[PDB]
Amino acid sequence: GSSGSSGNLLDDAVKRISEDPPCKCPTKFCVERLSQGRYRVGEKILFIRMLHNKHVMVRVGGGWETFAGYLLKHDPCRMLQISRVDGKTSPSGPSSG
Ligand SMILES: [Zn+2]
């Protein structure tokens, strides 16, 4: 749905980062704006926040990571760039509400 708000700082950054570097694959990643601090990343819904409008982090199931870092993880074409991560340790079982 359309809300009608000027260029949001968080959204502005998220949009850029997601489109920079631009996904090489023939299929652009899944990124849709739902609500202030909410975006559809891939096949899951996370809460992307901005620290002092300087740092971009996301809400995961056990802490917060760098948006650009969470994307590179899934995005294969991104993994190319020098990256260093472990993974995700969480007990299977989705949520609804
Ligand atoms: Zn890609």
Could you characterize the architecture of this molecule?
This protein has 97 residues and is α+β, with helices and mostly antiparallel strands. It has a single domain, classed as Gas2-like domain (Metal Transport, Frataxin, Chain A), CATH 3.30.920.20. It contains three helices and five strands, in the order H-E-E-E-E-E-H-H. It has a five-stranded antiparallel beta sheet with strand order 1-2-3-4-5. The protein is globular. It starts with 8 loop residues before the first helix and ends in an 18-residue tail after the last helix. The protein binds zinc ion (ZN). Zinc ion (ZN) binds next to helix 3. Required to maintain microtubule bundles in inner ear supporting cells, affording them with mechanical stiffness to transmit sound energy through the cochlea. It comes from Mus musculus (Mouse). Residues 8-78 form the GAR domain. Belongs to the GAS2 family.
Keywords:
alpha+beta; 5-stranded antiparallel β-sheet; 3 helices; 23% helix; apoptosis; Gas2 Domain; Zinc Binding Domain; Growth Arrest
Task: Give a quick precis of the structure.
It is classed as apoptosis. The entry lists the keywords Gas2 Domain, Zinc Binding Domain, Growth Arrest, Apoptosis, Cell Cycle, Structural Genomics, RIKEN Structural Genomics/Proteomics Initiative, rsgi. This protein has three helices and five strands.
| Oligomer status | monomer
> What is the CATH first-level class name?
Alpha Beta
The main sheet comes to: 5 strands, antiparallel
Order of helices and strands: HEEEEEHH
